[PDB]
Ligand binder design. Structure first.
Ligand SMILES: Nc1ncnc2c1ncn2[C@@H]1O[C@H](COP(=O)(O)O)[C@@H](OP(=O)(O)O)[C@H]1O
Length: 124
């Protein structure tokens, strides 16, 4: 199968690139990470920092999750990220996205033991 932690890495981690996401970045990544298999995932964020730095967020600023749960944490430092948003003319299976790089504090939900990220909640 695939653990929730593994799914988070597949859907949100892209340490390789520093911050040079091209205008085609999201179109390629959303497809390569299998986020356009059953349908076009509407919105998704990729984080370019190291796995160690992102996992460390689970021990940082505790903030309320959008769903009301209390297992969300905000990074003290800003992080290099890329937001992907499906375009209006996007039509599955030909999923199309707008790519936008940014440097913001990320908010992730963490679970388990080890306590690691399992959901990307927001960036601020
Ligand atoms: N506080 C929380 N703790 C754990 N999982 C959460 C959560 N808030 C939302 N989720 C869920 O975690 C999954 C991962 O989210 P994301 O893909 O945005 O990282 C989503 O479920 P689904 O994938 O079943 O919709 C989402 O609904």
């Amino acid at each position: 199968k695939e653990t929730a932690a593994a799914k988070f890495e597949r859907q949100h981690m892209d340490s390789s690139t520093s911050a040079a996401s091209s205008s085609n970045y999201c179109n390629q990544m959303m497809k390569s990470r299998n986020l356009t298999k059953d349908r076009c995932k509407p919105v998704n964020t990729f984080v370019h920092e190291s796995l160690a730095d992102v996992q460390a967020v689970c021990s940082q600023k505790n903030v309320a999750c959008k769903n009301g749960q209390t297992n969300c944490y905000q990074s003290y430092s800003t992080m290099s990220i890329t937001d992907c948003r499906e375009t209006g003319s996007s039509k599955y299976p030909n999923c199309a996205y707008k790519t936008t790089q940014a440097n913001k504090h990320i908010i992730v939900a963490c679970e388990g033991n080890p306590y690691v990220p399992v959901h990307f909640d927001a960036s601020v």
